[PDB]
Amino acid sequence: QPLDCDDIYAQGYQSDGVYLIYPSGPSVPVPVFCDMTTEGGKWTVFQKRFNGSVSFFRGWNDYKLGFGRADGEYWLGLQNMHLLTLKQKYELRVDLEDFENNTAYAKYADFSISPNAVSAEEDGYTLFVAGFEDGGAGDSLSYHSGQKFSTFDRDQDLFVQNCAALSSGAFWFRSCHFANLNGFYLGGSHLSYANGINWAQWKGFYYSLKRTEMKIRRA
Amino acid sequence: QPLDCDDIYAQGYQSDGVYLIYPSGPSVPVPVFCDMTTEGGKWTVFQKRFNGSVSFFRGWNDYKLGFGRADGEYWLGLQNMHLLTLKQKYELRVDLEDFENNTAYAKYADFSISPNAVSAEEDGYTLFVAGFEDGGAGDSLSYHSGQKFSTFDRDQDLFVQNCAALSSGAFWFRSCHFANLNGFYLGGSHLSYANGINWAQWKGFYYSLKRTEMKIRRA
Amino acid sequence: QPLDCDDIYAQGYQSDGVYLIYPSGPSVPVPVFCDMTTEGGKWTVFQKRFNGSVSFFRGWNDYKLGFGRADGEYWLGLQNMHLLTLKQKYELRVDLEDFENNTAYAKYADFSISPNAVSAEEDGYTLFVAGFEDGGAGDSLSYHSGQKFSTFDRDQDLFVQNCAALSSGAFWFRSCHFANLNGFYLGGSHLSYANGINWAQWKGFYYSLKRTEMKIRRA
Amino acid sequence: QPLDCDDIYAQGYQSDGVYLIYPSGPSVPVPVFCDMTTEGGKWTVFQKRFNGSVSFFRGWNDYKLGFGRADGEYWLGLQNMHLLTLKQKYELRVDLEDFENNTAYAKYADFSISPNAVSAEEDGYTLFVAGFEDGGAGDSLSYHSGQKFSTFDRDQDLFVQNCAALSSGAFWFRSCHFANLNGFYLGGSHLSYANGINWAQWKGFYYSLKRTEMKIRRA
Amino acid sequence: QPLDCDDIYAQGYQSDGVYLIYPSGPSVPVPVFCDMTTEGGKWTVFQKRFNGSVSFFRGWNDYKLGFGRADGEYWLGLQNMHLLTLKQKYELRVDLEDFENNTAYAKYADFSISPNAVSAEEDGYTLFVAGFEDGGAGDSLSYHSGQKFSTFDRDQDLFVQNCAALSSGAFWFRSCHFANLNGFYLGGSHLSYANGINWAQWKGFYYSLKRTEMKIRRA
Amino acid sequence: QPLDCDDIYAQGYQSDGVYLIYPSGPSVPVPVFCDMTTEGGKWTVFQKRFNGSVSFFRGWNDYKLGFGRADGEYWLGLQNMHLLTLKQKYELRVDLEDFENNTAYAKYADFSISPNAVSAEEDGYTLFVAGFEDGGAGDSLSYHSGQKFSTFDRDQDLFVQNCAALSSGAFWFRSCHFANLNGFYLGGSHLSYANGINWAQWKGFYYSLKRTEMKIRRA
Amino acid sequence: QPLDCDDIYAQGYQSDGVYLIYPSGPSVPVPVFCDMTTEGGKWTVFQKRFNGSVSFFRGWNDYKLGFGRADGEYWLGLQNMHLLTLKQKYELRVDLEDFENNTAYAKYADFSISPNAVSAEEDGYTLFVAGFEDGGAGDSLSYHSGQKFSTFDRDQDLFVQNCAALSSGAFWFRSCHFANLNGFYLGGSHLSYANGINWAQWKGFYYSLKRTEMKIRRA
Amino acid sequence: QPLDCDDIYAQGYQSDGVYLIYPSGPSVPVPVFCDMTTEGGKWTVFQKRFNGSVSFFRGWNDYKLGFGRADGEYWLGLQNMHLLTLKQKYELRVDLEDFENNTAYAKYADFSISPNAVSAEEDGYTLFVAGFEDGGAGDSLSYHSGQKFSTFDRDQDLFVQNCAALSSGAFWFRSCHFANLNGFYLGGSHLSYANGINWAQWKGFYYSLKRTEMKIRRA
Ligand SMILES: *[C@@H]1O[C@H](CO)[C@@H](O)[C@H](O)[C@H]1NC(C)=O
Ligand SMILES: *[C@@H]1O[C@H](CO)[C@@H](O)[C@H](O)[C@H]1NC(C)=O
Ligand SMILES: *[C@@H]1O[C@H](CO)[C@@H](O)[C@H](O)[C@H]1NC(C)=O
Ligand SMILES: *[C@@H]1O[C@H](CO)[C@@H](O)[C@H](O)[C@H]1NC(C)=O
Ligand SMILES: *[C@@H]1O[C@H](CO)[C@@H](O)[C@H](O)[C@H]1NC(C)=O
Ligand SMILES: *[C@@H]1O[C@H](CO)[C@@H](O)[C@H](O)[C@H]1NC(C)=O
Ligand SMILES: *[C@@H]1O[C@H](CO)[C@@H](O)[C@H](O)[C@H]1NC(C)=O
Ligand SMILES: *[C@@H]1O[C@H](CO)[C@@H](O)[C@H](O)[C@H]1NC(C)=O
Ligand SMILES: *[C@@H]1O[C@H](CO)[C@@H](O)[C@H](O)[C@H]1NC(C)=O
Ligand SMILES: *[C@@H]1O[C@H](CO)[C@@H](O)[C@H](O)[C@H]1NC(C)=O
Ligand SMILES: *[C@@H]1O[C@H](CO)[C@@H](O)[C@H](O)[C@H]1NC(C)=O
Ligand SMILES: *[C@@H]1O[C@H](CO)[C@@H](O)[C@H](O)[C@H]1NC(C)=O
Ligand SMILES: *[C@@H]1O[C@H](CO)[C@@H](O)[C@H](O)[C@H]1NC(C)=O
Ligand SMILES: *[C@@H]1O[C@H](CO)[C@@H](O)[C@H](O)[C@H]1NC(C)=O
Ligand SMILES: *[C@@H]1O[C@H](CO)[C@@H](O)[C@H](O)[C@H]1NC(C)=O
Ligand SMILES: *[C@@H]1O[C@H](CO)[C@@H](O)[C@H](O)[C@H]1NC(C)=O
Ligand SMILES: [Ca+2]
Ligand SMILES: [Ca+2]
Ligand SMILES: [Ca+2]
Ligand SMILES: [Ca+2]
């Protein structure tokens, strides 16, 4: 059974659209969007935003099990990505676009979630990335990694000691920085601090992007 | 293994009775009733009523997992119908019968439950039907679709704002019309408003039917 | 200390406005509106509506302990009225007005809540009324009495057996009748059945009033 | 303020009816029934049965706070009896009546509930009776005393070790004898073992009585 | 994989002892005792008692999932027996022995648990038996069947209405009868009513047996 | 008994120290600090900070009942302030001091908490202040009033719609301005936005003060 | 009403036995043992042990509200002692006896519980003692004080960091020392570390005493 | 699929590193560490410590599911070890090392967890070891076996009766000896009793070891 979009690239399915993958056994498949157009196909997607629509506040269960629709905006789910990356090696790519027409992207050579954990949930779905290659966006994930996933209803204890105020965000946080792609959908610019879709290296802490997309591919 | 009644029709088992199907793996089958005598066989049945007996009030867990008996009245369960419809395409048929001796039916070209959701339970098991084909009963499911399943204990909060009073029903609702085939079992006619087994197009909002049956078939 | 508006009528306070009463000891008083203008003063008020403003859906705790503001719309609370009527004899009066300018009223000679109960909450705050005297509104409370108070989150079991659908109302209910002064605030008229501020004897089941007020007085 | 029926006997109120007593402060009185016609008046009543009506199954909260009506059948409540007996000494009288026309009675010289406990609820509302005086009914409370109150939901754990089956009763128990005056209301005679209103000394374990009444008086 | 002791009788394992069976897939097997000595082998066992040791009070989860040890006393579990009997036809046999040396047995031609239920737990694991053949013990299970399984922590509502006192037993109960093989382990005889290991047809309501064993076999 | 510091000023107790007050009956007094040296004595104090020590994060229960020490920093409690202000009229004074050596103050003519609510807790302990009188600090409480008390665990739902991020503060809020005197204890100046002890009119949103004190007096 | 044994020493009650005191209003009194024999009377007791009998494991609620019997062993309750010491000044005395006949005692000039706390429970019922005067037992409470009360079900977090293992004791703990008079009742000597009734200054960490008693008196 | 390190030794993978094993079906593998260099390879490792790092306090869920990292310190999990040992026989080896430079080891001929239980969790994951073979460390697991697993939150009730104080440990206990290899990480020597990593036979109850490792192998 096809584990990812790589096996879908075989058996002559070199097209674009929603398919089925089998990350946790031959039963209960999952629909996912494979982008076979950019460089050579593959590029399994696990995040997508282009307009307001689906809200991204959510909680621990919703991030562990996934939400959204496959043809629109969605988040695959930490459990599924962990089960995928436990078996095979992979590689991460992130591309994003602001309001005008502007474009940029970034590439990382290695990507995994809780590499050698006996129980992935008990560790907390930590991040790992290595081998940054620029594309005009900058390195904003290498400072992280080694940090567990977090939410607004889980943690809210060590943040109040080291920093002030509550996080109210879902990403791999290292310090008091509150910039991530899982924030609220604001317009072109905002006056508040980092609470929208922010990529600090490209635009800054006062510009919320238009489209986000994170993909992985075997290497 | 057989997935539904269409595979039961093969291996020379063309008859009318309770069989076994395997929607969620080779283990733990489910007994169901296939009505192989109307048009061409197949016609997997996920709802049945002919007298009072089984009560249909229930809650979210019961409608998610299923209740009743295979030979009498029952409800297959939203989870199993979702698992069936995800893999293969289908087509919906409804046939109904008044108290005196009359019968009617309706047909829909496409039937699916939460088509492209990463998690079906988070979406709410929405309905989708298109391609109506008249048979003397009218169109009473096209106005809906795009709406989620609600019960008397899950939601009961957005209804008291637009409308008054509580719903106390189990169907895909769109507005304050509270007539559905999963209501109470009253006599031929009643003075209260739509709170029995009502099909709005055929009889109206003041007549509770005698027998109901919903069947799906591969197209 | 003044227990009710009768003691406030003494010590030369024969005016109209918000005062203080001491129903449960010399500590923790309660503000209440005394209407000393209609016939001879007194007339302690325990209900008031004149526009939408305060919602009346509420629950068991909110009806047991009271809610609202004294200068506007409010509900005193079953505990306070029980403590008042346990000590002294009283008498009930209800007056109401529709949209135009129309007026009417009704009078009852006796009023009490759980007269001889060892534990008032365990009985359920039953109603008692005797000696109806007409004023142009009719008798719509004598059919009740002997019936416990009810709500939408308490009961919802014996209603489904005897009647269909859920109550979603707060009053002393005897049968499947769903007309009371603690319903939703609709306009002059509505198409739905009794779910607004309905007094069946005066207007009917399709007219929601404008103003309601229930008072008590010693006799 | 009057504390019990003994103070009601003064101020010229020698009669038979429901009065008010103040066991827990000058506020929040409790209505009770004083039987001032048997020997010398007084005789505060904390239990009454003459027909089926009120059910006596109940739980720990109900027996702690009290249930029933003052004119009919009721249970005063362990808390109020404890508060009464703590301040003043008393004396217990029980009178009972079979179905046909017969009557009997018993007398105890001293009655108290949890005499010298810092917290009565933690002790379990133990019983203490001494100085039996025969009247034709026998001694059925001297074997007990020193034992705490138990119910069908509080304890139900030490009984399944010494004896078999569950208790489902509300009295001060000593061993596997499960006969008490707070049982079910059966007819004159029954085939099952002691599970009705049984007084072991007078009739036996196979006869459920018709009327019960427990009264206390100052000594 | 071997589903029961019948497949174990194949592949040349015609011996007596603890084996493994696969009732719910090729993973997570179950150890069970097969009695290949009486008539022709097979005879999968799902109950065993010969001395006090393991207690049988337990609850709903413990009866649904099973308890005990395979070489001693144990109860297989309603889920496992349901999964077994859903697939293949079977036949029930019960044999028992009192204190002296005495023996007896009974046979039933048909045995199943929730035959045509869409969700077995929702029905309640009902019993079915047909075709009694005597062996000196009598028919004491045909009066039952059609009745759901029950326990001391589940039900305790309809028993108090129809009968008095609490059940405190685990079997398929039809009326106020409290005799079953899942009771307390008493000696040869007892003075209390049916609360030990009682088979009413053979000995009576005052004799608790020594050994019990219930087996099933394909037919 | 003394109700506040105004009655403490009488009976010849004009001094500065911790005394006892009786807001909720003759029993269970509360120790408080009266500052009888500024203008005319009285000046009951319900808030105090001069260094870090006590933490002010807390929750709804702590702000309802009160925390801290009488001689150091503390919070009197919304319940006691409500009980005090309900009986008598009062008048609010606030005095504040920057880090270097500067001081300022403000005065309000009328101060009350939930003026005419039947139940204060259901209203939310709203604020009401009128009649500002400048002293060099500015008006920072007139924009509020009519708003209820909120915390980081009670509400946190209407804020994420109008504004972004969570509040994590304890004051009467009106809009997304999150500056109040019950924040964190930072140094003289900080780079983050208003999350310390900020008084907007005097210094701004980037300076956390050194000492705070709120006092009320009878008018 | 008599607040303590000092008022009982008035009105000519200079005897020894169980009396009543009124620490929280004129209602709900408390029985207590006053020792008017040692030096000059008074000596209100709040702890007593002379044999095994009553267990002292208990929890937070049992220590807050009190337990035991007044004529035997008991613990008054932190709430009652706090209410007593809030109003009047007092003085503490402790005396104890080992197995043989040996005796000793200690005296402290000042004793209080949460002196200036706005909410006593929120602080945690801290200890204060000053002015030690020897009597042959030594000073073992001055090292403590300023430390909150603790139990086995409350805390169990900071103990695991600073020390190892769980406390399982009820006293005012300062460091890893586990010697107190609220431990288990062992014989004359034991081999384990401090887990019995230990007073380190007199006997040591391996000797459990015979009798304990703590009293207070006004000064 | 490989079930343990013994099948990893085949297919030419004789090395030392982290591999994958399939104890609960073909899906969801678990990463583990095989130490293929001591005697003959194999030697699956289900415990590892060499410095402080990971904390071993934990609870019942963590010990049931497993925690830690494959390359560092970890605990495999009672469920997976039970699943492994149920299918095949094994043999236990323990090797330990003091702080200075010394090492030792012990061997047991048979190792299993809950051998013949219908439900392993209900039994408590009991231990069974036989056939000790000395290597210079002594026998410290033969006294146990037949005992269930206990933690600081599961049981903590039968211990306070036989012994004093709470356990706060995770091992198979028999009596009040509280020395096990899953304790706290202290230095070379400590003054407190057995609460670190203690092996009683080799060093004693006052020395916490440096490195631990438990391995099993097929026999
Ligand atoms: C957002 O995009 C989705 C993509 O299908 C579309 O369905 C939806 O209408 C869009 N919403 C708005 C407000 O543009
Ligand atoms: C972005 O591209 C679109 C082309 O569809 C154009 O209409 C728009 O003006 C561009 N934006 C800017 C800022 O030029
Ligand atoms: C309802 O139909 C079922 C069909 O299985 C039948 O068993 C039952 O007796 C019927 N009930 C009545 C009241 O006719
Ligand atoms: C309906 O058909 C049945 C046939 O079973 C017949 O007995 C009955 O009279 C018919 N009734 C009507 C109203 O047509
Ligand atoms: C409703 O009446 C109250 C009475 O004070 C008033 O404050 C409020 O503004 C009114 N609301 C509307 C919508 O008229
Ligand atoms: C009711 O009285 C008011 C007087 O303020 C008047 O304006 C209104 O027209 C009256 N309503 C009708 C229906 O005449
Ligand atoms: C039981 O006695 C009460 C006395 O108040 C009476 O009201 C009721 O009707 C009686 N019930 C029956 C069934 O006789
Ligand atoms: C009991 O006394 C009543 C008097 O009300 C009488 O009618 C009845 O016959 C008597 N019965 C017996 C058995 O004495
Ligand atoms: C009960 O039987 C089992 C069977 O193995 C045995 O282990 C146990 O010792 C027996 N107990 C008694 C009390 O005879
Ligand atoms: C039952 O059989 C055994 C044989 O081991 C014998 O010892 C015993 O006496 C028999 N019982 C009776 C009542 O004879
Ligand atoms: C804070 O002030 C209090 C005043 O009671 C004082 O006891 C404490 O030591 C101070 N803390 C610091 C860190 O100065
Ligand atoms: C503030 O006043 C203090 C007096 O205690 C003085 O020591 C300090 O130098 C002053 N600082 C400033 C900035 O005025
Ligand atoms: C312990 O002392 C109490 C004091 O009254 C006594 O009642 C009890 O019998 C004693 N227990 C033992 C075991 O000596
Ligand atoms: C303690 O005193 C008692 C007097 O009753 C005496 O019997 C006992 O021997 C004394 N203990 C010792 C150790 O002498
Ligand atoms: C403990 O050992 C681990 C081995 O992975 C190492 O990463 C860590 O730094 C060590 N910690 C210390 C304090 O030496
Ligand atoms: C232990 O061995 C190490 C080798 O790494 C050595 O450096 C150290 O001195 C030795 N210590 C002892 C006490 O033998
Ligand atoms: Ca967090
Ligand atoms: Ca209701
Ligand atoms: Ca039951
Ligand atoms: Ca603690």
Author numbering:
A (entry chain C), B (entry chain F), C (entry chain B), D (entry chain D), E (entry chain G), F (entry chain E), ...: 37 to 255
Text lifted from the article:
Microfibril-associated glycoprotein 4 (MFAP4) is a 36 kDa extracellular matrix glycoprotein present in elastic fibre-rich tissues. MFAP4 consists of an N-terminal signal peptide, an RGD recognition site for cell surface integrin receptors, and a C-terminal fibrinogen-related domain (FReD), which constitutes the bulk of the protein. MFAP4 partakes in elastin fibre formation (elastogenesis) and in extracellular matrix organisation by protein-protein and cell-matrix interactions. MFAP4 multimerises and interacts with elastogenic proteins, including fibrillin-1 and tropoelastin, and with cells via integrins.
The presented 2D classes were collectively used for initial reference generation and subsequent 3D reconstruction using C1 point group symmetry, confirming that MFAP4 organizes as an octameric structure. Further refinement of the 3D cryo-EM map with D2 symmetry produced a 3.55 Å resolution (masked Fourier shell correlation (FSC)half-map = 0.143, Supplementary Figs. 2 and 3) structure of octameric MFAP4. Thus, the top and bottom halves of the MFAP4 octamer, defined across the central XY plane, can be described as two tetramers, each composed of two dimers with N-termini linked by C34 disulphide bonds. Within the tetrameric top and bottom halves of the MFAP4 octamer, monomers interact through intra-tetrameric interfaces, including potential salt-bridge interactions between interchain residues R105-D159 and R94-E158, hydrogen bonds between interchain residues A106-N152, G104-E158, G104-V154, and R94-E158, as well as non-bonded interchain interactions between R105-N152, G104-D159 and F103-E158. The top and bottom halves of the MFAP4 octamer associate through inter-tetrameric interfaces, including a polar non-bonded interchain interaction between N231-A200 and non-polar non-bonded interchain interactions between V196-F93, L202-L202, S204-L202. Between tetrameric halves of the MFAP4 octamer, the buried solvent-accessible surface area is 433 Å2 and is shared between 22 contacting residues (13 residues from each adjacent chain). Although the N-termini preceding Q37 are not resolved within the map model and are predicted to be disordered regions by AlphaFold2, we observed that the Q37 residues of each of the four MFAP4 molecules at the top and bottom of an octamer are positioned to extend towards each other and outwards from the macromolecular assembly. This arrangement potentially positions four integrin-binding RGD motifs at each of the poles of the MFAP4 octamer (orange residues). We noticed that S186, D191, and Q192 sidechains, as well as the backbone carbonyl group of T187 were all capable of binding Ca2+ at this position. We propose that this Ca2+ helps to push loop A182-A206 away from MFAP4’s centre of mass and towards the opposing A182-A206 loop of the other MFAP4 molecules, thus stabilising inter-tetrameric interactions between V196-F93, L202-L202, S204-L202, and N231-A200 to form octamers.
